Amino acid sequence: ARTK
Amino acid sequence: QPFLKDHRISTFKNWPFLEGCACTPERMAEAGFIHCPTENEPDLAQCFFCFKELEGWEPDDDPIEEHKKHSSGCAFLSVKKQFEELTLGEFLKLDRERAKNKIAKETNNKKKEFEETAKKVRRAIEQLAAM
Ligand SMILES: [Zn+2]
């Protein structure tokens, strides 16, 4: 996952 | 309320990664996560405590591993007790940290929106500078  | 794993786990009634993956609604909810699907990022999940928002999950993403990795300074991460085993005092200090965390995310959003606007302003003023 990554930062929005 | 959000401190309850079960309030959290109930937000994933339309979460994609199910049994077979690592970021299952259970491992996610147990890591402080809550499902916040937008029309364009439907797998967006947010920590109920530090409010960091992570999207583009992957079947073998470990909700806890990703959590430490992006928001290392999150207090919820360091809670080692079960919820019911927290002293009322601990719960108060936790809840106060949380309010502080919400004030922080909001400040970030305010500053971020502001810089987005300022850059657009500075740039248009450069044009004049030239003439
Ligand atoms: Zn967090």
Residues B95, B102: Cα–Cα separation, whole Å: 11
Chain A touched by B74 (CB under 8 Å): no
CB nearest to A4's CB, from B54, B61, B66? B54
Residues B66, B12: Cα–Cα separation, whole Å: 18
> Resolution reached, in Å?
2.7
Phi, psi of B72 (to 5 degrees): -60, -30
Residues B35, B43: Cα–Cα separation, whole Å: 7
Identify the domain containing residue B71 by its residue range.
Answer: 1-131
Residues B46, B72: Cα–Cα separation, whole Å: 14
B16: tokens are 């994609």
Instruction: Report how many helices (DSSP H) and strands (DSSP E) chain A contains, helices first.
Output: 0, 1
Given a contact cutoff of 8 angstroms between Cβ atoms, the answer to whether B74 and B53 are in contact is: no
Given a contact cutoff of 8 angstroms between Cβ atoms, the answer to whether B71 and B49 are in contact is: no
Alpha carbon B121 to chain centroid, angstroms? 30
Question: Which one-letter amino acid corresponds to residue B28?
Answer: M
SS3 B1: coil
Given a contact cutoff of 8 angstroms between Cβ atoms, the answer to whether A1 and B64 are in contact is: no
Distance B100 CA to ligand 1 centre (A): 12
Given a contact cutoff of 8 angstroms between Cβ atoms, the answer to whether B31 and B17 are in contact is: no
SS3 B36: coil
Question: Which one-letter amino acid corresponds to residue B21?
Answer: C
Chain A touched by B61 (CB under 8 Å): yes
Residues B115, B104: Cα–Cα separation, whole Å: 16
Residues B40, B69: Cα–Cα separation, whole Å: 24
The CATH number of residue B13's host domain is: 1.10.1170.10
Q: What total number of domains does chain B contain?
A: 1
- Which residues on A lie below 8 Å from B70 (Cβ)? 1, 3
Given a contact cutoff of 8 angstroms between Cβ atoms, the answer to whether A4 and B44 are in contact is: yes
Distance B118 CA to ligand 1 centre (A): 30
B57: tokens are 């999950």
Mutation target vs A (from B47, B55, B64, B112; most A CBs, 10 A cutoff): B55
DSSP strands (E only) in chain B: 33-35, 45-47, 53-55
Of the candidates B52, B16, B20, B58, the one whose C-alpha atom is nearest the C-alpha of residue B37 is B16
Residues B102, B39: Cα–Cα separation, whole Å: 24
User: In terms of DSSP H, where are the helices of B1-87?
Assistant: 5-9, 25-29, 63-70
